[PDB]
Structures are given as C-alpha cells and as structure tokens.
A paper describes a structure:
The essential and metabolic enzyme adenylate kinase (AK) undergoes large-scale conformational changes in response to binding of its substrates ATP and AMP. Here, based on a comparative structure–function analysis of AK enzymes from E. coli and the archaea Odinarchaeota and from human AK1, we found that conformational changes in the enzymes are to a varying degree linked to bending, fraying, or unfolding/folding events of the termini of α-helices observed in various structural hot spots of the enzymes.
In the closed state, however, the side chain of Lys47 shifts rotamer and forms an electrostatic interaction with the side chain of Glu44 located at the N-terminus of the helix. The crystallographic structure of the AKeco Lys47Ala variant in complex with the inhibitor Ap5A was determined to 1.8 Å resolution. Structural comparison of the K47-helix in the Lys47Ala variant and in the native Ap5A-bound structure shows that there are no major changes to the helical structure. The observed local helical distortion caused by the side chain of Gln48 binding to the main chain nitrogen atom of Gly45 is further maintained in the Lys47Ala structure. From a functional perspective, the Lys47Ala variant displays a significant increase in k cat relative to the wild type (1.3-fold increase from 360 to 464 s–1), while K M values for the substrates ATP and AMP remain unchanged. The T m of the Lys47Ala variant in apo and Ap5A-bound states decreased with 3.4 and 3.0 °C, respectively, relative to the determined melting points for wild-type AKeco. These differences are significant, and the roughly equal degree of destabilization of the open and closed states indicates that the open-to-closed equilibrium is not affected in the Lys47Ala variant relative to that in the wild type. However, the local destabilization of the K47-helix resulting from the Lys to Ala replacement does correlate with an increased k cat value as observed for the Lys47Ala variant. On the other hand, the Lys47Ala replacement led to a less stable protein with a more dynamic K47-helix and increased catalytic activity.
Residue numbers in the entry: 1 to 214
Write the structure that this text describes.
Amino acid sequence: MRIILLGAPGAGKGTQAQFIMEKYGIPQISTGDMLRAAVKSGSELGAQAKDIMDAGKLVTDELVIALVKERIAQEDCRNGFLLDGFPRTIPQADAMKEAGINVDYVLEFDVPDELIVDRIVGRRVHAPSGRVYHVKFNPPKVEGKDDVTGEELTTRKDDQEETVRKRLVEYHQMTAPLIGYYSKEAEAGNTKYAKVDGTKPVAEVRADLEKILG
Ligand SMILES: Nc1ncnc2c1ncn2[C@@H]1O[C@H](COP(=O)(O)OP(=O)(O)OP(=O)(O)OP(=O)(O)OP(=O)(O)OC[C@H]2O[C@@H](n3cnc4c(N)ncnc43)[C@H](O)[C@@H]2O)[C@@H](O)[C@H]1O
Ligand code: NA
C-alpha cells in the first residue's frame, strides 16, 4: 500500500501517520523529519536548509526530490510507503509521476485556518522517531516525556506564531493546488481520494481513516 497525506500546517498528518505505519506495516517518508535530521547531524545533503526552515519558507524542489529518491530506494519500501510532507509543490508531484511512482490513496485533512496557530505553539516532539504531542489537546502520559521511549521531548525552533503565519501563506500559494492535482488523478483511475474532518478528536480521526483504508 502507498499513501500520500495532504493538508495545511498543523492539520494532524504526522499524528495519524504513526497509526497507519503500525497497522499496515509500511515506513513513513517525512521530508521535514529528514531535513531536521540532516541539520542536526551536519549532513552534506540537507544541512544547509536550517535558515530557510526558520524563516517559514519552502526549501528547493531539487533538494527534497533528492532526499526522497534516496530514501525510497531503500529496502523497507518494497511493500509500500507513506508520504508525509512530500509532494509539497506541483513540480514535486510531476517528478514522481515521471519517475513512474503511483500511489493507492491520497488522504486530505480538512482543518480551519483559525485552529492552526494554537495547535503549533503547543506542539512537543520526540526528534529521533518523529512522534508528536500537544501540551493541552494531546499530551504525553508523563509531562515532557515520550510515551514509547521515555526520552525528553523538545520544542521546534520554527513553531512560533509568526513563522506559522508565513508557512500558511506559502501553503495557500504553493501547496493547496495539489488537492486539485490528485482529485484529477483519482478521476482518471490512478488513485483513490478521500477527505477527513481533522477537527475531530485524535481517536475519531484514526477510526475514520481505518474505515477508508480497510
Ligand atoms: N516537501 C517539502 N518541500 C519543501 N520544503 C519542505 C518540504 N518538506 C519540509 N519542508 C521544509 O520543512 C518545513 C516544515 O515542514 P513540516 O516538517 O512538514 O512542518 P509544518 O509545515 O509546520 O506542518 P506539519 O506537517 O509538521 O503538521 P501536521 O499536519 O503533521 O500535524 P501534527 O500531527 O504535527 O499536529 C499538530 C499539533 O496539533 C496536535 N493535534 C494533532 N491532531 C489533533 C487533533 N485531532 N485534535 C487536536 N490536536 C491535534 C498535535 O499533537 C500537534 O501538537 C517547511 O516549512 C519547509 O521549509
Ligand atoms: Na494507483
């Protein structure tokens, strides 16, 4: 099974990706996690993304296309994979089509703009896994600690209100057009397309997604 998740910043994609990976046994390919890991380790491929991400802007198409082509060439992707944050522009989507990469489901998370800031300013993350929490809406079992490993959670440097506002403007200009792109692909028989109400509680969104995916 191959899946793409679409939606605005803070819509809940990373939260739901963890449940899909577990139930269907496929790896997640998260371009944001890969870029943040490259910055932390100083990797030649991606470490220069630091200043762009902290400004709330998208990194270049060529850099993230190379990161994804390297990741999915690997062996855990022979049974499928889940794309979370890629594609982010029409040229990234066209690059996947031209490479012959087709998917089975495109899942859109619908969330009103007015909810995004307060979701992101309360976000706390376990950087080694990509797992995510919220101090008010979805907290860990022990404050400040990852549920699965118990290790200390951190706050992302780009998760302040003014950066989030810039990311949303960028989303509307560059990324929202992918809803139409994959709606058109689904009408041609090339994938299934479905939308979920991302304002429901975490456990209900999970249940709605399981009904779609079977
Ligand atoms: N392909 C690409 N091309 C170019 N540049 C790229 C790129 N990919 C990455 N980049 C670069 O990386 C930067 C950051 O990108 P990115 O890493 O993708 O971060 P983002 O834009 O800020 O938004 P997310 O996708 O991380 O949010 P989400 O939909 O996953 O929701 P979440 O589960 O976290 O949940 C949000 C919060 O709400 C909480 N929450 C989740 N679900 C619910 C719920 N149902 N009810 C209440 N609260 C909830 C969560 O606990 C959490 O605290 C970009 O600006 C760009 O520079
Ligand atoms: Na397909």
